[PDB]
Paper text:
A common mechanism of resistance among fungal pathogens occurs due to mutations in the enzymatic target of azole drugs, the cytochrome P450 lanosterol 14α-demethylase (denoted as Erg11p or [name]). We have created and analysed the structure and function of surrogate triazole resistance phenotypes in the yeast [name] by creating [name]/H single site mutations in lanosterol 14α-demethylase that have homologues in numerous species of pathogenic fungi. This study shows how alterations to a water-mediated hydrogen-bonding network, between the drug and target protein, can affect the affinity of the short-tailed triazole drugs FLC and VCZ but not the long-tailed triazoles ITC and PCZ.
In addition to detecting the mutated residue, a water molecule (843) not present in the wild type structure was found between an oxygen of the ITC 1,3-dioxolane group, the propionates of heme rings A and D and the aromatic side chain of the F140 at distances of 4.0, 3.1, 2.5 and 3.3 Å, respectively. Water 843 replaced the phenolic hydroxyl group of Y140 but, because it makes no polar contacts with the inhibitor, it is unlikely to have any effect on ITC binding. The ScErg11p6 × His [name]/H mutations disrupt the water-mediated hydrogen bond network between enzyme and both FLC and VCZ.
Author numbering: 8 to 534
Write the structure that this text describes.
């Protein structure tokens, strides 16, 4: 033994004096071997869900998960069942598939999991400090209440003509259309829909001043701010690169613009009930009496606009793309437009939108097939026992829930990969509570989150934008349908989703050909 302890020390010294051909070599093989040995040992544990095997330490299953998450989930599900873990760029993600996974993650106790700890590192640099995920959950809850206060039926009634005006202006003025000059053309929907989305959301939520800014070089700041909203920021949120500083600059410049308007509205006592800015100026005091600062108000405006931007733009792109190979659905939607709007003699209102079930069912079905967020995350803050299992998810893990995956399962939606708006006949609401409700601070929502359809998530982190999204999408698609027919270039069809971007937008270029339904129809107004 004595001799052995000596030769241990000796072996150590001979180890340190290896040629750096082998030292560099051992710098690679040692962690590689430890990783594989650690996994085999991990597999022996019965209080842990199975862990997907991976070859490269730290990286884990990043590539296959990033490129095709639903295919990844399906294969893991076949081998391991509904609960399994995988390593992702240094983190361990525990996936719980299906309605029980929805319950496990969306209805997890506040003490058990943290959304802000999963999300803040990306969003905070983009939006700014003090809001959304850069604050305690209790603060988020009331910010959602504040924002929801501008998103009432009365507001939607006033937004609908504004959104309509923006859509028509876009048809009139955008080079992508120019309907007074051209009767047919080709567009990339991932060019048109982001523009139509920011134009309509700006006009209605932010108001005319902020909409007008988008016709200036100021619009480039939004483009710059947009480039900070990228999944890689979950890993590298701050690097001394240029686009990171353009991001920081844009946030300052845009929030500064919002603050300028806010302070100006207050100076002139010009605070009314037009938009989300008026609403937050009038209603942004927390229940402990602390008021949101003008900066936090501006930051919250940025987050709300950015949130609504990507989910909605991707969704209307998908709607156009699915309908492009379905002239039968376009035809059916057009008949409904003619029926509800008296052949076009009626002006579209929010109330008439609610009487367009097939149009709303079209949005609903598109959100089924294209959940914009394929994976929602929480960081596990306290050890969690998985009910009816021996599994414990330890603090420091992340949990991953994927309702968009269940959207595409035949067991819950027959012929799930078929686009069929009629699967929602007599069920055209954006969603609803099938039972008991609870209020986390921003209104009563469904207590259960077991619905296999969950485009807007559930529990305390549930979306509050769904009715604004349907309003915006509804107005936009109503006008599209009444104005245009469209189809694919020969041999083109619905593109696959890009699962590596922030939302599951279509892989580009995603082009459709439009044609005026009334070649001679003119859009009035000056330009
Ligand atoms: C590196 C190699 C490469 C192959 N790779 N390897 C892995 N990946 C990858 C993995 C995962 C993902 N992502 C996609 C994005 N995703 C995600 C994005 C946003 C998100 O948002 C949830 C929260 C925060 O943002 C919002 C989004 N939102 C909700 N409604 C509207 N937007 C949010 C909520 C509230 C407010 Cl005010 C703003 C915002 Cl933005 O909710 C959650 C997940 C995580 C997985 C992407 C790429 C790769 O690309
Ligand atoms: C089709 C459109 C949209 C879809 C499918 C969608 C989806 C979602 C989902 C799944 C969540 C929960 C995320 C999680 O649990 O981690 C969420 C949260 C949220 N979304 Fe949306 N969203 C949409 C549009 C919007 C719009 C238009 C707005 C604002 C007007 C908005 C603002 C918010 C807010 C404030 C939250 C709460 C975040 C939290 O509490 O952590 N969303 N959304």
């Amino acid at each position: 033994v004595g001799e052995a302890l000596e030769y241990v020390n000796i072996g150590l010294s001979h180890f340190l004096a290896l040629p750096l051909a082998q030292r560099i070599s051992l710098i690679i093989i040692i962690p590689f071997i430890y990783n594989i040995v650690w996994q085999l040992l991990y597999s022996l544990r019965k209080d842990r869900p199975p862990l997907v095997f991976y070859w490269i330490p730290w990286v884990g299953s990043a590539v296959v998960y990033g490129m095709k998450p639903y295919e990844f989930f399906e294969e893991c599900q076949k081998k391991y069942g509904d609960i399994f873990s995988f390593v992702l760029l240094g983190r361990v993600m525990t996936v719980y598939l299906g309605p029980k996974g929805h319950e496990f993650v969306f209805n997890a106790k506040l003490a058990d999991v943290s959304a802000e700890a999963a999300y803040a590192h990306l969003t905070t640099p983009v939006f700014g400090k003090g809001v959304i995920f850069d604050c305690p959950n209790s603060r988020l809850m009331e910010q959602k209440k504040f924002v929801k206060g501008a998103l009432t039926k009365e507001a939607f009634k006033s937004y609908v003509p504004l959104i309509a005006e923006e859509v028509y202006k876009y048809f009139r003025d955008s080079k992508n259309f120019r309907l007074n000059e051209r009767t047919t053309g080709t567009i990339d929907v991932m060019v048109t829909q982001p523009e139509m989305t920011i134009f309509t959301a700006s006009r209605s939520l932010l108001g005319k001043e902020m909409r007008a800014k988008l016709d200036t070089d100021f619009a480039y700041l939004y483009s710059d701010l947009d480039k900070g909203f990228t999944p890689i920021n979950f890993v590298f949120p701050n690097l001394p690169l240029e686009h990171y500083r353009k991001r920081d600059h844009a946030q300052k410049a845009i929030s500064g613009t919002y603050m300028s308007l806010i302070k100006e509205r207050r100076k002139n006592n010009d605070i009314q009930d037009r938009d989300l800015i008026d609403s937050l100026m009038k209603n942004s005091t927390y229940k402990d009496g602390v008021k949101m600062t003008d900066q936090e108000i501006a930051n919250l405006l940025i987050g709300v606009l950015m949130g609504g931007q990507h989910t909605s733009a991707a969704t209307s792109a998908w709607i156009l793309l699915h309908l492009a190979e379905r002239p039968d659905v376009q035809q059916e939607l057009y008949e409904e437009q003619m029926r509800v709007l008296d052949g076009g003699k009626k002006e579209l209102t929010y109330d008439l939108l609610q009487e367009m079930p097939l149009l709303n069912q079209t949005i609903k079905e598109t959100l089924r097939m294209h959940h914009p967020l394929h994976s929602l995350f929480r960081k596990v803050m306290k050890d969690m026992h998985v009910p009816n299992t021996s599994y414990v998810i330890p603090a420091g893990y992340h949990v991953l829930v994927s309702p968009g995956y269940t959207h595409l399962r035949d067991e819950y939606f027959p012929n799930a990969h078929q686009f069929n708006i009629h699967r929602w006949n007599n069920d055209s609401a954006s969603s609803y509570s099938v039972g008991e409700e609870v209020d986390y601070g921003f209104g009563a929502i469904s207590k259960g989150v077991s619905s296999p359809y969950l485009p807007f998530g559930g529990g305390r982190h549930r979306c509050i934008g769904e009715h604004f999204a349907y309003c915006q999408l509804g107005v936009l698609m109503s006008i599209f349908i009444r104005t245009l027919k469209w189809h694919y270039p020969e041999g083109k069809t619905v593109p696959p989703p890009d699962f590596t971007s922030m939302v599951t937008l279509p892989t580009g270029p995603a082009k459709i050909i439009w044609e005026k339904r009334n070649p001679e129809q003119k859009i009035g107004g000056r330009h």
